[PDB]
Structure 1
């Protein structure tokens, strides 16, 4: 019994190590501390100062160096008594100021305890090393245990959700968000691993197919970035389907915002999508030859970042893994071949060199790349050729071929590549769903694995999109926390800005940012300047959450939940329409490839609806929210410990900033205001009995006993509330209590 076996790995890796004794006395201490900023400039950097004296309204303390400093009781960040160091839930803390929250998290992380609850949230901090807590034996310990009966773990919230589903006969959701590198994907895979074990059968085909879908999507959707070697370049909502009996019966995946741009360009040190590298590494000498493949260095779309390999990863071996997953899900070798051929053609398309200066219109002298690409796509090179540099364009009733220059030509080519790529991804997702997805499903548990708020040096359309989704999600949480808190107070018999940001973005009348973008999108000749001027015109000094910059002519600010975000408007018009020359659709529509034809002939893949990329985004987000609203949700906040991808380096600034953005500190702020500590009567007595010359450690009349102690200590009754089963304490009270003499 691992949970009770102090020698188990359960104990070792998931719990604060327990010694012989539990006795209150052990933690007795005379010292009182405060959390302060040694450098008022650096507000997330604190140090602990021992309070030396006080006055009626201030405290005086001793800094790190022996420097006396003084502070206002009302501004003091008291440090919780040592007993509170390491608790499994931040809600168990008596003083809930920020530094206190950070400290508890750090104490845990220093013992490699990466999971901690904060009220409704599970906080998960990437340790940047592999903790062996996800084995099958680990899976087994969580089975059917209540939140309160086992240590914090992704498995634990996954079991709670599964039991809630079976118990309440209600669909569930797990929202796993945070920064790139935080471990969202990793935890999402633990959730699926867990559910397939606790609810799978014949332990099975279905289960292996479900498990095998990820690997497929990661290869086409993930890439090495400067922040994560296996970054998810798309967001996802996975629906895990169960029958009335609680057995897994299916799955469906919805994908969002794939970064198609990466296909054609990658920043220094970054890589293109894994798959490109997998193919080249792993294709068979005979496959290479038939696909006209070479090394990556020979491909414009793969030889620009300087990086083509990932430390400790075998593209060849992963390829194996990827083809294997495909086999298992059920992709026919033929299908597999066309996939690779599409990957191939894309690489060929990127190798096309456009030349000019004949006229002012582009040409192709060498036609090797083109032929290469046409061959693999199964399209007519001459048609491809014309469609690239001489697309026929509607100007009046006049349908006329325009000779584009090398640039436009190049950009068009890039558009083609992006379309193929995104359409292929979409088709792979549908293919997967077909195999996995249930028409008739009884229940589901869905997992969202998407980033939280994004605030980079440069914020663009995709950033607004993701932050727009995050305002919606933060508002969902806030509505939820609010219902739950009330219920609680109710069961124990104890006595917005979101909307405004949301409206500025998605409002229809008056029109918000996306509506004005859609409007401009209809005018072929609109520009970045017309757009941004229109935005400023409607919101500058007119909408409280918008800000026109003092100098930049190309950006605008939005006050988000997480703070102000500055956006740059370049290419939004283009991003919004995501254009592709009709002649290009025509060309490929004739492909002789059984997969390619689908990318262009199926209106479900080839087209958005004519609705804009913003309108589609807004639509998909609303459906998503509609689905979530039907579930009982569970929130996991994944946090990166620093920006360097290193273990054992938990950076206060880095962390605190995330806690600020993701809603964890707000929640505590709100919680701290009422009765943050709610404890089961017996639990209380068991620990504090010895503070009153009355009480029996054990005692049927636990509430009475509680009242004994309280009374004995002369506690201010405004400080607590007797609930039906727990005693409710205001912030700080419990700390003073812990501090009482036996």
Structure 2
């Protein structure tokens, strides 16, 4: 078995290679060094400065440059002992700086060791290249092993979650967050792969359908972006259900924040959702015409980015898969026709060209596109038409038709296309749950795959939402950690409420006084309100009045929020519209009556076609509240997915790119946090082992251990605070271990 077999791929690909030497001796060297910046402008850069002279206060050190400087002792980023280079859990490090953390991540990454623990977290750095560690053979090795037993790995956290479920009869959760392209979705699929293996139907029908859902969701909710060729344009919470026996009984999927806008617009080089391209590459020459299908270059919705294909991707071939998956989960052939018809029609509606000329309102000179949409949708063109350009509107009394100009007409068409697509996605999800979900379930393991904090060039309503969710998840973490401590130091014999996250949280979601969303909702009821009134109202209530808010020196359309991960500047353009998310009623009417059986559902099912009516912000707050409650009932696990750089290249781990993520994701906080206490809390039989020699008394594997522990401390004649005697482990403060290991034989 590979765990013991230094020749196995397990050893190869998952562990830091070992030689038959054990020496605390081999390790040995005669000097002591540190972490510095060869230019304080760029601080994430650092070099190792050999300390040469010491004082009492500071420390002089030699540079890579050859030069020599001086630092404060209380400003020192002390380099851990080389022995530590590559440890599996950074919680093991003596000095817990930032460069110290990055260094260990890097040393590992240079060895292709992408997974590392950091206390509670499992850190995973995208390698941007394939690493064969996800085979069934790799699966098998993880089975039933403790975290301390095997190398860091997603499979590992998954197994721990599963045994805890079974053991504690407690539900579990895995929170997988981080930047686009960090490896969130990849890792999530592995979690499910692993679960399906260790808990499914021996070689499964359900298992396959559960497996087959992703690809259905991915064709519809995934798209190529500059950051990822297969970006998830929606968030999700996957619940894997089990019976009391521990076997998979079902599953359920919750989706969030689907990027509807992408349907009608994609940035340069980007792509619209995958399905569009698959549909047009894989339908038969015969389904096309049937759908009046042509090429992407012939569609407005697909010929604007300039990108219509992905390197290493066969849209026609990926379409088989999708269609296949639909078949497995159980989509009727006719259910499938309709899904494709919708996609097609949406493709047609974008092809509609409004012209003005005539007077002031828009007009449809050519009805080619219109007709085609109507056809495939199973709707009556003149109505659609009428609904698009001349929608009836209330004047309280007056239900009267308005004649839309070209732009207004266009936006409506767009609003229509977006509704169609989001409702469709909704339906797909429901339909899948319908098949997979269990009413009757004993336990569950839930997997949250959603982005981490979003701080772009342009931050809008959607970034606020994701950011809000992130503040809550970050608060959950901190709290959790706080608790894992409160009752627990009180386990191995150790000593000794309000969140800093609350204010930010309150600023956004508070009811009284009203926070951003409430005022946003308020402004939403007045039809005649604007981005300006809105932004005016926010500044009015929070400028110089709320500490987490900032009114810009100059911009009149943005505001800043001091988030966990730092300040984020938001722009309010279109927020009223986004909050209401309007669709002309006649449009609804047009479609409520549709030949198409799938279409009817989208407009006829209040579960699909309607919000509550609550606002988009109200609904978001609500679903965020439901999600957390659930989480609150689980034993959680945190995975931090990191991109090594912004270029999608392997072998390029950029200190700035990385640290920034470490800063924003809570990895850096937790560290410094325990940093304060007693992080190093070693095992007795574990210290005397590597440290029986540095003491003229102590021998290797003995019985009276904690006593033996006393020895070296004695021989080493150490002080009452750098260390702590705790029933099981010897708690060591920071650098205690460094210095210690830093002694002679």
What TM-score, normalized to structure 2?
A: 0.99
Q: CA deviation at 1:485?
A: 2.4
Deviation at 1:181, TM superposition (A): 0.4
Give the match for residue 723 of structure 1: 726
| d(CA) in 2 for partners of 1:220, 1:26 | 56
Deviation at 1:642, TM superposition (A): 0.1
C-alpha separation in 2, matches of 1:611 and 1:465:
16
The alpha-carbon deviation at position 489 of structure 1 amounts to: 1.2
Structure 2 CA distance, aligned partners of 1:322 and 1:203?
A: 23
CA deviations 1:199-238 (Å, max 9, x no partner) are 0013210000000000000000000000000000000000
What's the offset of the Cα at 1:596?
0.3
Q: CA deviation at 1:82?
A: 0.5
- Cα offset for 1:544? 0.5
1:727 aligned counterpart, secondary structure: strand
Equivalences, count: 742
SS in structure 1 of the partner of residue 394 of structure 2: strand
Question: In structure 2, what is the Cα distance between the partners aligned to 1:513 and 1:246?
Answer: 44
User: In 1, distance between residues paired with 2:528 and 2:5?
Assistant: 72
Specify the SS of the correspondent of 2:692.
helix
Superposed displacement of residue 30, structure 1: 1.3
> 1:25 maps to which residue?
25
Aligned to 2:643: 640
Superposed CA deviations along residues 436-479 of structure 1, whole A, max 9, x for unmatched, are 00001000000000000000000000000000000000000000
19-28 or 451-460: which moved more?
Answer: 19-28
The question of 1:402 aligning with 2:402 is answered: yes
Task: State the shift of 1:698 in Å.
Answer: 1.0
* Superposition deviation, residue 719 in structure 1: 1.1
Q: For 1:410 and 1:147, how far apart are their aligned partners in 2?
A: 56
Question: Cα distance, 1:516 vs. partner?
Answer: 0.1
1:507 aligns with 2:510: yes
Spell out, residue by residue over 1:328-366, the C-alpha distance to the aligned partner (whole angstroms, 9 max, x if none).
000000000000000000000000000112110111011
2: CA distance between counterparts of 1:488 and 1:677? 16
Unaligned runs of 5+ in 2: none
CA shift, 1:54, in A, is 1.0
Task: Give the drift of 1:666.
Answer: 0.2
Quick one: distance in 1 between partners of 2:169 and 2:5? 34
Cα RMSD for the two superposed structures: 0.5
How far has the Cα of 1:33 moved from its partner? 1.2
Indicate the residue corresponding to 2:335 in structure 1.
335
Q: CA deviation at 1:715?
A: 0.7
Alpha-carbon shift at residue 58 of structure 1 (Å): 1.2
**1:497 CA drift (Å):** 2.1
Query: C-alpha separation between the residues in 2 aligned to 1:702 and 1:21?
Result: 24
- Post-superposition Cα deviations, 1:154-204, rounded to whole Å, max 9, x if no partner, equal 000000000000000000000000000000000000000000000001321
Residue 67 of structure 1 deviates from its aligned partner by 0.7
Counterparts of 1:171-570 in structure 2, within 5 Å, are: 171-495=171-495, 496-570=499-573
Shift of residue 488, structure 1, vs aligned partner:
3.5
Segments ≥4 residues shifted beyond 2 Å: 485-488
**CA deviation map 1:462-509 (0-9, x unaligned):** 000000000000000000011112343111111122000000000000
C-alpha offsets along residues 37-83 of structure 1, whole Å, 9 cap, x if unaligned? Answer: 11101111111010110111111010011010111111111000100
Tell me the SS of whatever aligns to 1:365.
coil
SS in 1 for 2:512: coil
1:717 positional shift: 1.7
Q: What CA distance in whole angstroms lies between the structure 2 residues aligned with 1:727 and 1:487?
A: 19
Equivalent residue, structure 2, for 1:692: 695
Post-superposition offset of 1:541: 0.2
Cα distance per residue 1:702-741 (max 9 Å; x no partner): 1000001101101112111111110000000000011000
> Using the alignment, how far apart are the partners of 2:571 and 2:143 within structure 1?
49
- SS of 1:557 mapped into structure 2: strand
Structure-2 separation of matches of 1:139 and 1:360: 66
In 2: Cα distance, 1:477 partner to 1:74 partner: 29
Q: Partners in 1 of 2:24 and 2:705 — Cα distance?
A: 19
Aligned-partner SS, 1:202: coil
TM-score when scaled to structure 1?
Answer: 1.00
* CA–CA distance in structure 2, aligned partners of residues 735 and 231 of structure 1: 43
Listed one character per residue, the Cα deviations across residues 616-653 of structure 1 (whole Å, up to 9, x for unaligned) are 00000000000000000000000000000000000000
Q: Deviations over 1:538-577 (max 9, x none)?
A: 0000000000000000000000000000000000000000
